[PDB]
């Protein structure tokens, strides 16, 4: 399984990166845009903000195939092992195919649908990343679209991961994983969420407390 | 997983072969008839616009299995690899048995039911093509016809697969695809819905404007 | 139970008004459009065309709330007792309450989610009418969001009622129907297919058959 | 409930309403064919054969809507109570609709798909008969069309009932009388292996031996 | 609801009267057989044995509905209030029927199938009794049986009522209970297992031993 | 629906009445025996610690059926309206029978199994006590015996009440609850626990730090 | 059913009023703090800014029930018609039965499980008022207990109804009302996401394209 | 898996072999009687009658395990490699276990209950055959008995095999399939209905019809 | 699978070793008892009795874990191959961890409860015996009990086999079957009804006759 963050905050993903198990970091335009950096700023600062290890991903920007694979050699030669992100439309399917044959790594984005995703995964995208709440938001069923398109990579294209992705609690993150899903990304808030309960900190109160009451201390 | 186009298009298979992972195209009878060309001009032509490679198949018209075998020879020799579509009745079984004694590749097509389909892939033919729309436009289920009939290849004919056939919405290709089908071809139209989302469109169009209100241009 | 055709086809109408048992003919502006002939003169035709009963629905244009308002004081104008189509928009809900206030029934359109249907019924909508083949096709599910809304209108609005539109294939009329839908409306192809079934037509021959071959006649 | 035999066997029916609590006989086409005798014998007959009490059903032969009609007045003036059955076309709903206006009560026959069937009960039939084996010998579930069809005229045309007709084995009756069906009409082999059980005669045989083993006579 | 018991043991039912909240006792030729007393002897006995109160069934010998009639009236000739039960088979149907054309209330028993069983229901019989662990025993499901029973009664003949018998344990009464059973007839055997339980007693016996401990006796 | 709480203990009562919803305080002779007070002592007691209002249950400890009526008249003499508990035993059966006969209420306990349970309730009972942990302690389930009881109950002596019993988690009380249980008995314990969380306490003490960093105060 | 707003901006609620179906507008000591605003100012505010109709929802600051029911008096005279919000304590619910007796009607809040949320319904509480998302991020299932509440509600205390609180998501606020919510109350955020939809603002752009191509103009 | 003919028509056989994918023929005494033909004339003919390939079954007659050993040896001097039915009663079983030490392979036959079909295959038999019709026609589920046996052999008794047997229609036929049976044997009225379909007859006249529109002609 | 008689009767398990596929013959002391021959008599007799072949099972006696383990060696000095009984508890799963470091094969029996069950195989039993119709005859579920049971054998402690034991009908045999049981043993009578069914012998009959008509006779 593989546990990213989403986002372009350098200074939380170094803070985080001790305590999570991160497998990496993904970014698309709007987080970039958020943080304010540069591609060529933000990128080898992430990479390095987690101890030089990890994957990272970002998104083309560009309108025709042939433009769309222009920007994944600019962003390959940022980070040399990064993994590409293409809306998945009929010119990044094609941006996709082409990719394949080069070699280099993609993952469809911008999913709202099972069959869009499994398209993105037959036309050689290693990740395939649906928008759970902005599916939810819109008066669908973001988790069901998950269940599927995980279902779909499963049977009919395999070396393809579900990376979900846009999440504003974290049972929708919970229900992701509970269908299946081989990789996930979180932004920062839901993840703190995930960490950070009052019921636990009331169980750790009450050990200290009846440590104190057997021993006159709270320590070991 | 293979996916098919079912058309006699040949500038629209050229067109959307860059775009979607393509298996190859499907034909019958009356997509054949539509485009008026001959099958020894379209096949050709539909297997040059795949970029020479790629699974064609086509339909026996004879009504007898003797006949049948002919039609298929007749077809083999404009397509020397070309899968022969034969309509699962009496005597399209004792063609796909005389067939696969021929080793000529066989598809079980017009079924409406899935012991008939079941019958077909017994009978040796590699694939078998249930007509969902058919199905479902006639007051029965096509959804459960192919999850049945699926499932019943899978049990009893393991070598045979399901091609999935005639649609009128997305939603029956992604329902036969949740159920299992290792095969399936789409009318154009219904390919290029599935291609296509207002909401994949804004969620694009979002990305440009944050990035354009962050560094000054739409471009990477 | 209440049946509409969905339709601005007069000639049609009238045709399939003696067969079919209409409650009406639903139009849009799509709909109005293609068969270019002006609200004036259309809505009078079609209220004709049905022997002068049944209830007849049209849509609104504006963008704005009191705009809207506007455009159904001029449908009204045309047809007394038409029923005022309402996409629901934020302007659109609001158009609704004034609507509601000044005793003009409305419908609730262009429906894509379950909450947003509802919204609309509570609003003073007495019909809402989800867009079920552009859900199916957009990669939601056309059918459940239909189930969800009547659940929702069922319990929470019950004065107001379902009218499924949107159709490509009967299966999809079928399951809005099994699903509790009070009404419904059918393009022209899917209400023919619906009354038209070889299995139906080769048990009337075999009757027809049966008879002559006892009788010497296929008459009674 | 309702229940019916379905035959022109007149000297069957006499024997067997003294046994089943029947409500009448239907008949169609082939049923009168195979007993060759004309509907202006068979019909007074079959009348008598139950004590001049119960329902009589019998079918249309024409073509158009207005020679149905006039195939139903005839049908009246031999059996003045007589229902009327007709095929389920677009001809047959027209005639079902100018019956209904005539104060003619109709059944609604060759029903192969729910919506067909509750069309037929909208236009004004009082039965509706889905041909169950049919549907099952066809590759479709003759069990899940009588299902939906018996609850779409519960929700949508509660003044009809389902007539299941079309039976070749008991299993088919009892899931049909499971699923709701308030008629229901069986032919005669049918029906008597509905009453004859081996396992129930082993147990009155059991009966018997116990009894005479105790009081030395079989009788009371 | 109404509780009997199934059998012919005159000295345990009246035993067991004043413990059950018993509606009667049920008997068969078996049950009389083996406690060899005539029926002329044992059921005023039994009847006297419940306090004078309750209802009695018992059953026909006859082979031939005339016969069950006459064998009907001698039983009501002993007891004048007393259930006849009729072994549903072709001529106890016609038996059935003409009991309820002169107004004695029957129960229709050796019920091995759903349908069997609503037919007699349908024939007027007012009680249907069917074998539960016969059809267990011999490879069926009681449970699945009575369950369907009871639905069918519901719906399509609701003035009657399903007395399930024969039984082997308790798990079978509880179920029958659970499916809706309305009546129901125990063995000795089970009924005593029914309200004797190891851990009961061992709960009472926990309590005196509490209140022994506090109090220094076991009484109040 | 009637909360109980299942206690001896007159102080905890008296301070718990003025939080929770009473209708009542049951008693059994393990809970009356660990307060070592007597019956003549602690039920007054109780009375007065909930406002001289709601409803008291008290067990009988006699082993017969004569012994448990006159058990049940002493403590009649006790508290005039107390419900008198009768363990679903042989004696117990019989002993609720002659206690329905003189009008005074009962509660059918110790019941382990829904078919016991049942006929408590048959044989006069109000409300019918099953031992939920107990249940669940020696390896059955509490909460299906539960289920099954408030269905028998419901179905065949809707007179009657389940009087959930038995606790040592709140999920236990919870899911009696859902199962429709109309009433219930809760240890104090289980009762605090079901007011007492770490969550909502988190809850309050962030509306106070929010109210305080506004306000100036934690008071409104 | 009921809609409210889960607010104290005031400009945003006169503004959304005309646009949504409101029954009022709910608050909390966050949502007040937030608006730095005190309650003598914000809620007459809120009143007018919805047309001096509607109803009102404010919290309790008070630790004790005393002091409590003396913050619910504070809240009645600033508005009239106020309910009052408490959080489901010990407290809490000794509050809501001393509100009860005084005629104030009150609302159960801080809700986090189904028996703590039923438990101030038995006390009195008109309205019980869960936190779905709060369920949800500390690792429970909102909606789960949502559903529970409903149904121990409707069961056990049928005059009170779930207001269901606390959102992120529309999907969450739809699970809600799917499972039988009678009052909702949303934050703007999630109110506005549930109007605004890119397949609906796709689907009226069209229907102003078809307009215009066939009639010059975009307006009736 | 394995299809077979049920019936003794030579005939037949001979023409559907070339139709039908079949790996055998299946006789039952019945079937044998029917066609009047002694065991060592019709079996040689059926045999040649295939083309001399695919496995033969035939049924002993003998009462006793030692007489149905020698009707084994009888069966197989007739058809060397022939499969012998045997009923599976007392001496069936003792007989199965006697022909397992002597090599000969078997079939469990007159299989109406699952654990019975069971008992068979732990016996050594390599095929049982339930009989779905005559379970069905008496009030049992012949699919849920085919089902649980499937199920009992695969964890049980893996080597063997269902062969499901006794059918009036194809609904039947696909449930045994669907429920993993992994032989079948049809008569030949219901193999005849499972080929001959009138909407796949539509659809291949429709295709004839739609090539001579654009070729002037119905053939390739 | 393992297949066994419960049973001390020598001339019966000599009688049914022929018919049935034995694996052996289980024993416990009141089986013993009420065949009142000692252990040293009946186990030998019992042995020959199935041709010297098949598994043996017998109970001790002795309360404390070292009194059993004598019992064992006792036990295990008449028949050097035997399995030993220990009852499931305190002193017997201390007896079984005892007898599983003496290398003696052990079944853990009088197992009412799933957990109880596991912890005997956990301790080192081969087998574990749950007693069917007691857990049902005492108002729980015999046949969850047994599902749950070989699912916690199957996670948990995959050496061990159930062996169900305990019943009054063949249902709750083929329950446990279906429930996956490894192993079962079952009284005479219940294994006798399992291979005696009226059904059977009908169709048996039916056969003779039929060749009878035929051939003139009724053998081969």
């Known amino acids: 399984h593989e546990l990213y963050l989403d986002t372009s905050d350098v200074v939380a993903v ?4 001790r305590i999570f198990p991160l497998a990496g970091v993904t970014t698309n335009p709007s987080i970039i845009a958020a943080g304010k950096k540069p591609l060529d700023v933000v990128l080898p600062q992430l990479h390095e ?15 025709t195939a042939e433009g769309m694979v ?19 439309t009929a010119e990044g399917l094609a941006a996709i195919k082409m990719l394949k044959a080069e070699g280099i790594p993609t993952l469809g984005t911008a999913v709202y649908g099972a069959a869009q995703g499994l398209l993105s995964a037959l036309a050689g995208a ?8 902005r599916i939810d938001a819109q008066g669908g069923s973001g988790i069901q679209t998950v269940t599927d398109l995980h279902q ?3 049977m009919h294209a ?13 049972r929708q993150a919970l229900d ?14 839901v993840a703190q969420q995930m960490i950070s309960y009052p019921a636990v900190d009331a169980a750790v109160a009450k050990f200290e407390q009846d440590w104190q009451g057997a021993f006159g201390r709270t320590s070991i």
Do not use: H, W
């Open 158 to 170: 395999p070396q393809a991961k579900v990376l979900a992705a846009s999440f504003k609690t974290p």
């Open 49 to 63: 903000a987690m101890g030089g290890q990890g994957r990272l991903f970002a998104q083309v920007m560009a309108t």
């Open 176 to 189: 992701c994983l509970l269908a299946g899903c081989e990789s996930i990304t979180l932004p920062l808030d």
């Open 152 to 154: 779909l990579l499963k």
């Open 70 to 88: 222009n920007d994944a050699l600019k962003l390959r030669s940022i980070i040399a092992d990064i993994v590409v992100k293409v809306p998945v």
């Open 14 to 17: 170094k803070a985080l990166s």
């Open 126 to 133: 290693e990740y395939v990343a649906p928008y759970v709440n």
